[PDB]
Curated annotation (Swiss-Prot), chain A:
SUPFAM superfamilies: P-loop containing nucleoside triphosphate hydrolases (SSF52540). This is NADH dehydrogenase [ubiquinone] 1 alpha subcomplex subunit 10, mitochondrial. Complex I is composed of 45 different subunits. This a component of the hydrophobic protein fraction. It comes from Bos taurus. Pfam families: dNK. The modification N6-succinyllysine is found at K87. The modification N6-acetyllysine is found at K87.
From Swiss-Prot, chain C:
Keywords: Acetylation, Electron transport, Membrane, Mitochondrion, Mitochondrion inner membrane, Respiratory chain, Transmembrane, Transmembrane helix, Transport. It is a multi-pass membrane protein. It holds the Pfam family Tim17. Its main location: mitochondrion. The modification N-acetylalanine is found at A1. One of its GO terms (cellular component) is mitochondrial inner membrane. Complex I is composed of 45 different subunits. This is NADH dehydrogenase [ubiquinone] 1 alpha subcomplex subunit 11. Belongs to the complex I NDUFA11 subunit family. Accessory subunit of the mitochondrial membrane respiratory chain NADH dehydrogenase (Complex I), that is believed not to be involved in catalysis. Complex I functions in the transfer of electrons from NADH to the respiratory chain. The immediate electron acceptor for the enzyme is believed to be ubiquinone. The keyword Amino-acid biosynthesis does not apply. InterPro entries: NDUFA11. It comes from Bos taurus (Bovine).
Curated annotation (Swiss-Prot), chain D:
This is NADH dehydrogenase [ubiquinone] iron-sulfur protein 2, mitochondrial. It comes from the Eukaryota. Signal peptide: none annotated. Belongs to the complex I 49 kDa subunit family. The lineage of its organism: Eukaryota, Metazoa, Chordata, Craniata, Vertebrata. The modification N6-acetyllysine is found at K28.
Swiss-Prot record, chain F:
Core subunit of respiratory chain NADH dehydrogenase (Complex I) which is composed of 45 different subunits. The lineage of its organism: Eukaryota, Metazoa, Chordata, Craniata, Vertebrata. Belongs to the complex I subunit 5 family. It comes from the Eukaryota. The chain crosses the membrane at residues 26-46. It is found in: Mitochondrion inner membrane. The chain holds residues 557 to 606 of 606 of the full protein. Core subunit of the mitochondrial membrane respiratory chain NADH dehydrogenase (Complex I) which catalyzes electron transfer from NADH through the respiratory chain, using ubiquinone as an electron acceptor. Essential for the catalytic activity and assembly of complex I. This is NADH-ubiquinone oxidoreductase chain 5.
Length: 320, 459, 140, 36, 347, 50, 63
């Protein structure tokens, strides 16, 4: 059965599937900190599902055929444009950040849905709990207006409060000059235009705000670039955590049923990411919104609800 | 009437099941076939009306209005399809559906025997009309125009609902055939004064009566072209048709209750005609012209003589085709210059020769050139109001002078003089536009050869 | 309130002017008290004396309106010698309408109140003459 | 094009009330999720 | 809430109402109201926030006060007739108390102040129960005691409710407050016709329940609680805007929609009783409701309000809420006028 | 007559009446106090208890 | 349609409508009398059922 109260009444309870390995682990750090590699190793060693960092096209990867959609359907948010013209008048900077927060919010729901439905833990790369560091860095460099920050906090306030924090937070502390050296080595043309001040603000946001906050309710593990290479040691530390903090200890089948009822409904997950706060960076006028939506409905397998698209080979429509 | 109701309903699945690019071809072609069959309603007898069933009936009053109603739908479809070209397909189909549903309500409104059935359908026409104006109008003010249109009408119609229900309780029926035989005189009392007003004011707002007219210029300036055509050609005539029927049961009280409304209409027609001389918006000028013409209809209906009822019926038909034609002429300029200002584009006869002939013919019917049915109707009303009181000839005469002045002034300003130098997108007239104009004027002028079919039951 | 309306309607028209004004003023004055009561309850006055000032303000206006209506309406019937004519109360209604405009110092409100009060008062006389029921007893 | 509501037009319907008065000047829209 | 407990609490709400409608004894009627109130508080509190706590508290005080007045009327009736049978009362003072008690329960003006606040403070699904199912029990009692009801009192309550409901809704941007004032106005029509023809009270009640359930269901489908949130529906579910448009016009009493039928039939009954001024006044005052329904149609359906960039993410996910009975309810909300004579089944 | 029945004059009246109806403090104390006034005038002025 | 078909179709319509009008007027009169006198099946408001009364000898004799 599709999950709901009836399935819950018949035994589908989260505690019957969650073991001692049913942990949500998030890996955090600065740009070019090798967190992607460490996250991939923890999942393999621990037998957890790995979630790549949620980019602009994360939602595209979870719907339809899984392939990225043209950029107009993402709102023309561009990470490349952000580096070249961080203060552009089209409001690309905040529009990207608002879009990225929504993508992370969706990914966190996908992760929690996986954990609660199968009992298998997941590994994320950053999350909606640490997404603000980029917002703070953007604001401190003058890339976004103060009203943009207010909109971000309004959206974050009414969304993050629904979800539990990660069981484990793994922070990889790479000093800015080392990161500034690794960005140049990585040979990305646009990324090479980043400044240390922006990178320093990102680092300050983790240490000033993120890590102290998560310590109050999570198991926080910190490492350097060298200490991070030893994946076995990191996984050894994770397997020896106590778990005596945070709200995960107060959860029970009843509360997790309500949480699973939320995270499984993606439109309910995104309900408040589009509150009618008319802000120039994220506001789209009616004519552009109308015709872009019409184009979206014309994409293959997008006119009708999944399973009712003849143009992609669905069958038995007259009985579905 | 089912032979017209059902095919009209079938236009809806026809539009929705048509190929993507054949929505205009299919709906136009088949609504013309319906219009063709509407001539079978001409089986009118000299004593009895054509009484189909317990629900619907036609007589010489409703038949010409029914044919005008069914002829106007294909014309509204040709008029609309250009400015709706960039609309998405589903919204085009919904627009056509609103027009089809409006025709369905109208042909049922004009044929209902029972007056509450008339009331409901008479009221049902509000919904699609409002949707057309507010959804597919062009400018911001269309939301206010919808509100004025809705609440002017309801301020009058709700008292009518109370009065009709009161009448049925007392009389026992609202079937119009029964009311012809069971009608009793209305005796003087304050109760009957308000019963008279409740029975009439709803129709007066529709005409519209002078003083209750300010909603009409707003609606026309804001409505799309099809909205203007149906508004001017048929919707105003619901008030006239309602008054023509309900005055049966208001005698003899109408003898003195009419005076304030005759004074408003007799004076109102002169004021609205003079207003037309100073209007700057071409759609607003035509809207004021309609108020002036409908003022005669109100007077003719109120004085209740055979000649005036014949004049009222002929004027209602003639005005419908003329005013709808004028809006289409004004719209064709608008679709080129995107402005309703009358002085913006001048000397257009030099650039659009044939379209200037349509302007001339439309203006000649508006000023009622003999022997057009516009004059026949106006002349009959002038004859009957002279007997009502000889002095009225002065007011009628002055109005005919002013009517010629603004009719030709509109022609002279837009078509003659020197063309505006900087306007250089005046492309030649399309076949669609020329056909649209000629489908107004040709039936109008052909009716001159056989006027009796538009003179109503009193013929 | 039935009793107060009874003595007003018990008396003929254009007779005992001083009695009609007493009745209309009493009817109007009470309405100002009812309006005042809900006002102080639902909008707490700043001070006890502030509430008294508001109560007097509303009650005086309502009493004044009813006083003028009865005075003007009963004189008009007296001078015109037309006891059973709605136009008498049309004059009485507008008079009370103007007083409201004065008390509110708004010529626009006075004109608006004149029409609405004038028509309302005229309709009340027609209903009295022809037995219009507002709260009709069920019969069928 | 046909006119459609802009941001200014939309904000008429975004306040605590439709017709501001001196007595409601301090009112504020309730929280998006009803939580205070 | 545990799903099994939620079902049990919902059935207790229903059972409390049913007891009121099947009882021939005043004590059992009072017990039904007590049971119903006991089970309705948990569903108002089920999201645990201060606004929900305030709403439940304001609801409890109002309903508890009314139930005390109902019991006082029952005992006065017992003193002067020596029996408990649910029917006309045998003392005028008991009739006034019972009528005022039931007006308080229904939220009619001037006991109306709680309805906008309680509805605003509880979830949409709870508001749906509050403004629909909860009217059944008080109306079913009014249906049985109307012969002893003071005509002036009941018509005064009706007129004030139509005025207050109409005026209150003009100043609202919150969808739950709009529905609350819509409810107050509609209770006024139901009780105006009660002295003349109780069958038309039932007709108006049933039709009102259907349209109100339709609106609440469509608000839930999109999780909209504000006018501006509802103005985004065009860029997500265009069909829903058309359904909302039709339902609102029906609630406005426009022909040829179902919501015209109750206003039409009520006008007929009062005119048969030589009541002309009251129906005319009520119909005109009901244009106030039509105005702020039309305003919603303007921002929802007839114009396209500005959107937000993040809305594009919603395009990719289907509507997964149950929307139970919505296709049926919306069709009955709009297309029932041709079947109006069927109102005799209620006779 | 114009000032009385203009669209602007009718619209303002309802707008003014709406603010009177809706501008409330939200306090339990004031709403119930209004219930008390309602019951008293029901019996004292209108004799609804008879 | 020929003139005789329409003519006699009109008579059938008139007969039905005339009969309905008469019945409508009677119903208003019947309803008025039933409500005023309570001697008909309509407006029959319930009274206590006498089959609920206990007729057996009571504990004391005077009753
Ligand atoms: C037989 C019938 C039954 C008889 C019962 C006999 C008595 C037995 C006791 C009955 C229970 C009484 C309970 C009283 C109570 O608890 O409320 C206290 C209530 C609230 O207490 P509080 O929070 O401390 O505030 C005190 C003031 O209200 C000040 O607070 P404030 O912040 O509001 O200050 C400004 C003040 C300003 O006051 C004003 O402006 C008054 C202006 C009036 C103009 C005339 O505002 C008010 O007073 C609001 C109320 C004004 C009256 C509204 C119009 C009625 O205060 C009062 O109003 C005192 C009135 C008590 C009078 C006792 C006699 C009762 C008569 C009632 C009518 C019975 C008819 C039947
Ligand atoms: C005369 C005055 C004017 C006309 C008055 C008419 C009043 C309404 C008439 C009753 C309307 C009932 C709804 C029509 C049936 C539509 C549902 C359907 O056909 O789906 C087949 C239904 C399930 O189809 P689905 O794909 O899951 O969803 C269908 C709709 O979306 C499901 O939409 P839903 O979420 O709203 O489901 C509601 C339905 C639940 O849907 C059902 O389980 C079907 C129950 C149909 C009951 C038939 C009622 C008529 C017979 C009266 C005896 O609730 C009921 O159980 C109705 C009782 O299959 C069955 O259960 C067959 C019935 C087995 C017993
Ligand atoms: C708000 C109140 C508006 C004032 C309405 C007052 C009209 C009088 C209605 C009335 O109660 O008259 C009673 C009478 C029925 O009584 P009956 O038995 O037939 O004869 C005895 C006469 N006392 O009634 C009748 O005989 C005739 C009643 C017919 C229904 C009239 C409906 C009232 C119309 C009021 C508005 C009229 C003006 C329209 C305004 C449109 C504005 C654009
Ligand atoms: C049952 C019989 C009851 C008869 C009384 C019915 C009236 C009940 C009142 C319900 C409406 C409550 C809303 C309301 O009245 O608004 C508050 C208002 C205070 O506003 P304020 O400016 O002080 O007074 C101006 C009045 N011209 O207060 C008032 O104006 C009053
Ligand atoms: C005829 C009217 C039919 C009305 C049918 C209404 C069906 C319910 C509304 C359909 C929309 C989806 C739905 O099922 O409603 C949700 C609601 C349950 O609440 P929900 O928030 O969805 O989840 C509860 C877990 N906390 O569901 C409910 O709580 C049910 C509340 C509505 C029941 C009252 C309906 C009005 C009274 C009907 C009697 C008609 C006489
Ligand atoms: C028979 C007796 C009863 C008589 C009373 C009248 C009954 C009729 C009322 C029935 C109830 C309302 C249901 C109407 C069905 C509407 C469905 C429809 O026509 O299409 C909606 C349209 C489709 O949108 P969607 O499917 O999401 O995507 C389109 C891509 N192809 O959605 C859109 O594209 C949005 C278009 C923009 C919105 C345009 C709004 C104006 C058109 C509204 C028409 C409906 C008005 C209903 C009022 C009654 C009309 C008389
Ligand atoms: C077109 C308009 C007409 C459509 C009417 C459709 C109504 C549904 C059909 C029901 C027909 C029926 O028999 O019910 C009529 C019934 C009669 O009312 P009653 O109080 O019993 O006494 C009548 C004496 N005059 O009274 C009623 O049933 C109407 C009152 C409805 C109250 C809803 C109560 C719901 C309780 C359901 C409990 C079970 C949970 C489901
Ligand atoms: C913009 C419009 C605003 C609303 C307008 C509403 C008009 C409503 C009219 C009110 C009802 C008519 O007015 C009412 O008629 C009845 C008669 O049936 C009168 O009834 C009384 O008249 C006689 C006069 O001898 C008295 O002896 C006796 O007390 C009683 O019969 C009322 O004294 C009168 O107040
Ligand atoms: C919200 C305030 C709540 C306060 C509740 C206070 C308790 C009220 C007690 C009411 C009980 C007494 O109620 C009252 O008793 C007397 C005694 O026969 C009745 O009798 C009185 O009225 C009728 C009128 O024809 C006749 O019986 C008689 O002329 C007269 O004595 C009243 O009709 C009844 O209304
Ligand atoms: C004959 C019966 C007629 C029944 C008519 C139906 C009742 C309709 C009720 C509408 C009442 C509210 O209507 C409301 O009026 C005010 C006019 O001040 C408008 O308000 C507008 O004008 C006022 C000043 O004029 C400005 O201060 C305000 O900023 C502006 O928004 C509202 O935008 C409109 O929504
Ligand atoms: N503006 C913005 N950029 C972001 C955000 N998340 C990632 N990015 C950018 O995405 C780019 C790549 O992300 P990173 O994972 O941090 O760098 P990486 O080299 O690819 O991954 P690792 O070296 O393994 O840590 C960086 O330039 C980031 O600045 C965000 O929330 N906001
Ligand atoms: Mg990376």
């Amino acid at each position: 059965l599709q999950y709901g109260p009836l399935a819950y009444i018949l035994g589908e309870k989260a505690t019957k599937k969650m073991t001692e390995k049913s942990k949500l682990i998030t890996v955090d750090g600065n740009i070019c900190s090798g967190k992607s590699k460490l996250a991939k190793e923890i999942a393999e060693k621990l037998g957890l599902k790995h979630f790549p960092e949620a980019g602009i096209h994360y939602v595209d990867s979870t719907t339809g055929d899984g392939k990225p959609l043209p950029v107009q359907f993402s709102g023309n948010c561009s990470l490349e444009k952000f580096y070249d013209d961080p203060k552009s008048n089209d409001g690309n900077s905040y529009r990207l950040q608002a879009w990225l927060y929504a993508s992370r919010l969706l990914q966190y729901a996908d992760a929690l849905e996986h954990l609660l439905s199968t009992g298998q833990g997941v590994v994320l790369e950053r999350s909606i709990y640490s997404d603000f560091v980029f917002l703070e860095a953007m604001y401190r460099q003058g890339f976004i207006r103060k009203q943009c920050v207010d909109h971000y906090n309004q959206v974050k306030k009414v969304t993050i409060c629904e979800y539990l924090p990660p069981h484990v937070v793994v922070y990889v502390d790479v000093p800015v000059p080392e990161v500034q050296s690794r960005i140049q080595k990585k040979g990305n043309p646009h990324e090479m235009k980043i400044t240390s001040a922006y990178l320093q603000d990102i680092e300050n946001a983790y240490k000033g705000t993120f890590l102290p906050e998560m310590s109050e309710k999570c198991e926080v593990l910190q490492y350097s670039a060298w200490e991070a290479q030893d994946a076995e040691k990191v996984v050894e530390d994770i397997e020896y955590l106590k778990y005596d903090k945070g709200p995960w200890l107060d959860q029970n089948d009843r509360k997790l049923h309500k949480l699973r009822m939320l995270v499984q409904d993606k439109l309910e997950v995104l309900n408040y990411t589009s509150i009618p706060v008319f802000l120039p960076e994220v506001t789209v006028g009616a004519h552009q919104s109308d015709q872009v939506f019409q184009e979206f409905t014309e994409l293959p397998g997008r006119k009708y609800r999944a399973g009712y698209n003849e143009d992609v080979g669905d069958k038995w429509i007259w009985l579905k | 009437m089912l032979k017209y109701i059902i095919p009209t309903i079938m236009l809806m699945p026809l539009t929705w099941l048509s190929k993507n690019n054949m929505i205009w071809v299919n709906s136009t072609a088949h609504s013309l076939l319906i219009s063709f069959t509407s001539l079978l309603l001409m089986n009118q007898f000299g004593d009895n009306s054509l009484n189909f069933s317990l629900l619907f009936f036609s007589d010489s009053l409703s038949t010409p209005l029914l044919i005008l109603t069914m002829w106007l739908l294909p014309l509204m479809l040709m008029a609309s399809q250009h400015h709706l070209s960039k609309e998405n397909l589903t919204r085009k189909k919904l627009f056509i559906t609103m027009l089809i549903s409006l025709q369905l309500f109208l042909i049922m409104t004009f044929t209902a025997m029972e007056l509450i059935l008339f009331y409901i359908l008479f009221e049902a026409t509000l919904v699609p009309t409002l949707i057309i104006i507010t959804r597919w109008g062009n400018q911001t003010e269309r939301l206010n125009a919808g509100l004025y249109f809705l609440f002017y009408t309801l301020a009058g119609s709700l008292p009518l609902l109370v009065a009709l229900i009161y009448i049925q309780n007392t009389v026992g029926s609202l079937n119009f055939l029964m009311l012809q035989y069971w009608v009793q005189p209305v005796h003087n009392s304050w109760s009957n004064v308000f019963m008279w007003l409740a029975c009439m004011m709803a129709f007066m707002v529709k005409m519209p009566l002078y003083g209750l007219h300010l909603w009409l210029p707003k609606a026309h300036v804001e409505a799309p072209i099809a909205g203007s055509m149906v508004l001017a050609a048929v919707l105003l005539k619901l008030g006239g048709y309602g008054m023509l029927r309900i005055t049966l049961i208001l005698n003899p009280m109408t003898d003195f209750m009419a005076y304030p409304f005759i004074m408003l209409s007799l004076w109102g027609m002169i004021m609205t005609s003079s207003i037309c001389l100073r209007q700057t918006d071409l759609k607003s000028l035509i809207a004021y012209s309609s108020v002036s013409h409908m003022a005669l209809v109100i007077v003719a209906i109120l004085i209740q003589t055979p000649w005036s009822y014949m004049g009222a019926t002929a004027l209602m038909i003639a005005h419908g085709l003329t005013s709808s034609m004028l809006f289409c002429l004004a719209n064709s300029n608008y679709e080129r210059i995107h402005s309703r200002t009358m002085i913006l584009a001048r000397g257009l006869q030099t650039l659009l020769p044939l379209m200037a002939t349509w302007w001339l013919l439309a203006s000649l019917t508006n000023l009622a050139l003999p022997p057009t049915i516009n004059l026949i109707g106006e002349l009959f009303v002038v004859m009957s109001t002279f007997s009502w009181s000889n002095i009225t000839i002065i007011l009628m005469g002055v109005n005919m002078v002013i009517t010629a002045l603004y009719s030709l002034y509109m022609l002279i300003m837009t078509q003659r003089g020197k063309y505006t130098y900087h306007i250089n997108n005046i492309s030649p007239s399309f076949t669609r536009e020329n056909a649209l104009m000629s489908l107004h004027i040709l039936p109008l002028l052909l009716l001159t050869l056989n006027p009796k079919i538009i003179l109503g039951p009193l013929y | 309130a039935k009793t107060v309306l009874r003595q007003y309607w018990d008396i003929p028209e254009g007779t005992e002017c001083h009695r009609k004004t007493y009745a209309t003023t009493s009817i109007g004055g009470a309405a100002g008290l009812v309006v005042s009561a809900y006002s102080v309850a639902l909008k707490t006055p700043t001070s006890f004396l502030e509430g008294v000032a508001r109560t007097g303000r509303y009650t005086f206006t309502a009493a004044a309106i009813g006083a003028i209506f009865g005075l003007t309406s009963c004189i008009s019937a007296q001078v015109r010698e037309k006891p059973d004519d709605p136009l008498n109360y049309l004059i009485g209604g507008c008079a009370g309408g103007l007083i409201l405009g004065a008390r509110t110092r708004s010529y626009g409100i006075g004109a608006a109140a004149c029409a609405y009060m004038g028509l309302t008062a005229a309709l009340v006389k027609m209903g009295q003459l022809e037995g219009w029921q507002v709260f009709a007893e069920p019969k069928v | 094009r046909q006119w459609q509501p802009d941001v200014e037009w939309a904000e008429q319907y975004g306040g605590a009330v439709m017709y501001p008065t001196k007595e409601t000047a301090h009112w504020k829209p309730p929280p998006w999720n009803d939580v205070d | 809430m545990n799903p099994i407990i939620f079902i049990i609490i919902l059935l207790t709400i229903m059972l409390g109402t049913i007891i009121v409608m099947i009882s021939s004894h005043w004590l059992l009627v009072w017990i039904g109201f007590e049971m119903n109130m006991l089970a309705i508080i948990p569903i108002m509190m089920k999201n645990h926030n201060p606004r929900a706590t305030e709403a439940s508290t304001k609801y409890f005080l109002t309903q508890s006060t009314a139930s005390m007045l109902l019991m006082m009327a029952v005992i006065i009736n017992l003193m002067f007739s020596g029996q408990w049978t649910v029917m006309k009362l045998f003392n005028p003072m008991a009739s006034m108390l019972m009528t005022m008690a039931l007006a308080m329960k229904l939220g009619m003006a001037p006991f109306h102040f709680w309805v906008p606040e309680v509805t605003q403070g509880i979830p949409l699904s709870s508001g749906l129960i509050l403004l629909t199912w909860q009217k059944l029990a008080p109306m079913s009692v009014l249906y049985q005691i109307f012969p002893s009801i003071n005509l002036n009192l009941i018509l005064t309550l009706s007129v004030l409710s139509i005025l207050i409901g109409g005026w209150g809704g003009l100043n609202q941007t919150q969808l739950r407050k709009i529905m609350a004032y819509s409810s107050i106005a509609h209770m006024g029509w139901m009780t105006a016709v009660l002295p003349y023809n109780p069958t038309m009270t039932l007709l108006n009640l049933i039709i009102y329940i259907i349209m109100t359930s339709t609106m609440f269901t469509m608000f839930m489908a999109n999780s909209t609680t504000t006018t501006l949130s509802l103005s985004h529906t065009w860029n997500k579910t265009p069909i829903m805007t058309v359904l909302i448009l039709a339902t609102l016009l029906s609630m406005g009493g426009l022909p040829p929609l179902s919501g015209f039928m109750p206003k039409w039939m009520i006008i007929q009954e009062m005119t048969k009783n030589n009541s002309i001024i009251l129906p005319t006044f009520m119909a005109i005052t009901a244009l106030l409701n039509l105005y702020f329904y039309m305003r919603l149609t303007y921002s929802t359906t007839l114009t396209m309000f500005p959107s937000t960039n993040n809305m594009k993410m919603k395009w990719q996910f289907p509507l997964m809420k149950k929307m139970t009975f919505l296709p049926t309810m919306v069709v009955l909300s709009t297309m029932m006028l041709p079947l109006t004579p069927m109102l005799s089944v209620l006779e | 007559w114009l000032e009385a029945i203009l669209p602007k004059t009718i619209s303002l009246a309802q707008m003014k009446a709406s603010t009177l109806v809706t501008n409330q403090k939200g306090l339990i104390k004031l709403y119930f106090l209004s219930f008390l006034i309602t019951i008293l005038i029901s019996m004292i002025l209108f004799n609804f208890h008879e | 349609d020929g003139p005789e078909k329409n003519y006699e179709r009109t008579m059938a319509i008139l007969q039905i409508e005339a009969e309905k009008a008469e019945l409508r007027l009677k119903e208003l009169e019947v309803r008025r009398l039933m409500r005023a006198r309570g001697d008909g099946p309509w407006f029959h408001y319930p009274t206590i059922d006498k089959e609920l009364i206990d007729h057996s000898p009571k504990a004391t004799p005077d009753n």
